[PDB]
């Protein structure tokens, strides 16, 4: 007998006065009746919520606490659409993120709400494509806000920080579960120079965690843009993140490798030739790309574990997988290039290249490809990549041995 | 006159080849590829020479093989011609072979000239393949027949024949494991062919050359598995297990479809008893069980392989095998002592780290989830990079 009416009753009560015991009980009670989300009750509850917003809004901490506490608990009753999540953005999320309450449990509550929308199993759950569309809208707004906040000039440095801190947290949590989706939002903005550092720092943090689905990222064209970054930009800090990112995502590909091989050769070249005085070899290129130099009138803070992710590991993976061509390429890059239809866009000192490269080469066992393939058949001949799945199994079993 | 120069030389030698060897050089110049009429001639000559001077004693063989070795790249042969050579040369040698290594060396030189080739079309039509396949078949047939047949009055003569055959078969296998596996298939169905065949087959696998992932297409793998679950003989079962352990790494795909069979074989091999030996099974079907008296790479390795890769099911299957068997539909052939399975498996389990699969999959998603097997690419790349670090 009237469970919508009891809910609205309880709802009304708790917003005019933080004890939610009555309300939680009604939600539980109510769900036993509408165990799937009801489109007219959603509509109704939202009008109640909007009504009360006019009366007592989000303008002080005690109210924000109350609001987040309540929204977090009703939102499983509602169906939302792209217009709706816009309303919550403007009424709740933007005002919090733009000037966040410095109490962790309040932010925790924000994150419950955000993440209820962002993360879900059934796409059919609110009818049609509503579920997916609200996630797409929310994340696009978070990303857009993050990117812009990371770049605008300034109203107290401390407060701007408080906002990025929240956004980075949220975006890393979202990234480790939805790496494709996040990379995809990031593509858009990444073509804009000053965004590259704030974006990459989030994307390397996502990928650090070595969570699942990392192999989806290249479909989105984000891996391509990181290579571009690595091929053309100039800022040590950015190229530093650039390399880190590609080093972590590489073992997850083997497939997008046979199309970026030459590009990785060139990247290896450039990073190995870094100069104390002239930094990274400048390119003669861009094309459409638009370079990011450091001091560019004429974010940041690289994490401590990224130093150990240098060009020496790039060598190891290239040598392990494409030794013949790799060493053929080193030793004469410009010659290798002309015969494989690409260009070297860096002035470099060949002796130095050959000394440094020797140095690393000497830490490696001799590669048995030289007994089996030619430089040309190393490239063709996909039979090679079977060996690989035998070596997997054996390493798997050894990983599982105790002693 | 080009060809006659050659033929004089062949007449000459058969009664120190330098002249012959040199005439073959000039011949090859005028006829870069093999010539069908010239070939026919030369073999027709050889056959006459055979009449009056054959393969019947040990100075003649050193000689014959030496010659046939050097001339044979000129020739073109067919299923019926290798029959001629089988009949005059190969069979009589292998049958009572000359105890001199360089003599047997020349033999192999010739055999492998036929068996291995870098060009299907070389002799026109589909001739090269025909020959290879004919020779390999006859080599197989004699190994099989010579291995089983009971011997009358001659046992050191026997060992010498198989010593050669084995040596030829293994060399062949390591280059052409698909092909050798095929030939062995029909013989394998016959109970006593199984040991001699496997002992050759493990020795091919052992060498971990290419391309062993072709073998299961031939059904040899399936036959060895049938062997593993039904046969009684320690020795043969011991080879069976050795074969599968060394073949398994190279599969990762036939695994999804032999899993329940592998579980059953792990059960059987671990339940081996000092007195009743392997669990005597009960089904066979049409298999025809090899027994013994008709008248160091063991089960812990298999445990490791199944625990990595299919931990949840493997362990759900131990603890209650018969139960696992219904619900997945196969059955358990053996009686066994459950508390002893539970004890033996606990010993091995305890040598292993705990498995991340229990945090990510159900028994059913562990079986039906293609995403899982993509982790593999990643780990392999890393192991590889580490194999190539030098300290």
UniProtKB/Swiss-Prot annotation, chain A:
Localization terms from the record: Cytoplasm
Covered residues, full protein: 1 to 431 of 899
Gene Ontology cellular-component terms listed: cytoplasm; TSC1-TSC2 complex
Record's keyword annotation contains Coiled coil: yes
A GO molecular-function annotation: GTPase activator activity
Highest taxon in the source lineage: Eukaryota
Protein name: Tuberous sclerosis 1 protein homolog
Described function: Together with tsc2, required for uptake of various amino acids from the environment and for proper conjugation. Involved in induction of gene expression of permeases and genes required for meiosis upon nitrogen starvation. May act as a GTPase-activating protein (GAP) for the small GTPase rhb1.
A Gene Ontology BP annotation from the UniProt entry: positive regulation of L-arginine import across plasma membrane
Subunit note: Interacts with tsc2.
Keyword tags: Coiled coil, Cytoplasm
């Amino acid at each position: 007998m009237m469970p919508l009416q009891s809910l609205v009753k309880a709802l009304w009560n708790v917003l005019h006065e933080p004890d939610l015991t009555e309300l939680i009980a009604e939600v539980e009670s109510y769900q036993q009746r509408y165990p799937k989300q009801n489109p007219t009750n959603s509509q109704k509850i939202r009008h109640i919520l909007d009504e009360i917003y006019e009366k007592t809004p989000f303008n002080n901490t005690r109210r924000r606490i109350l609001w987040l506490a309540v929204l977090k608990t009703v939102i499983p009753l509602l169906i939302l659409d792209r217009q709706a999540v816009g309303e919550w953005w403007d009424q709740i999320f933007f005002p919090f993120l733009n000037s966040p309450t410095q109490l962790k449990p309040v932010f925790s509550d924000l994150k419950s709400i955000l993440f209820y929308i962002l993360i879900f199993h059934d796409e059919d759950e609110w009818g049609g494509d509503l579920r997916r569309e609200c996630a797409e809208e929310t994340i696009t707004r978070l990303v857009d806000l993050y990117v812009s906040k990371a770049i605008e000039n300034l109203e107290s440095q401390e407060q701007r920080n408080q906002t990025i801190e929240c956004l980075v947290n949220v975006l890393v949590h979202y990234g480790i579960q939805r790496p494709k989706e996040l990379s995809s939002c990031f593509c858009h903005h990444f073509l804009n120079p000053p965004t590259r550092i704030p974006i990459l720092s989030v994307m390397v943090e996502v990928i650090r965690r070595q969570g699942p689905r990392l192999y989806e990222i290249p479909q989105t064209g984000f891996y391509d843009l990181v290579l571009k970054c690595a091929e053309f930009d100039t800022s040590p800090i950015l190229l530093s993140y650039a390399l880190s990112f590609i080093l972590m995502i590489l073992s997850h590909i083997c497939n997008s490798l046979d199309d970026s091989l030459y590009r990785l050769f060139c990247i290896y070249l450039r990073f190995s030739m870094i100069d104390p005085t002239s930094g990274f070899p400048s390119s003669t290129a861009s094309g459409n790309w638009e370079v990011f130099h450091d001091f560019m009138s004429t974010g940041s803070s690289q994490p401590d574990y990224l130093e150990s992710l240098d060009y020496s590991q790039l060598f190891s993976i290239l040598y392990a997988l494409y030794p013949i061509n790799f060493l053929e390429f080193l030793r004469d890059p410009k010659l290798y290039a002309s015969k494989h239809n690409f260009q070297i866009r860096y002035s470099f000192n060949q002796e130095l290249l050959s000394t440094k490269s020797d140095g690393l080469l000497g830490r490696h066992l001799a590669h048995s490809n030289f007994l089996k393939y030619t430089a040309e058949t190393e490239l063709t001949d996909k039979s090679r990549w079977t060996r690989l799945d035998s070596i997997a199994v054996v390493a798997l079993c050894n990983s599982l041995n105790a002693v």
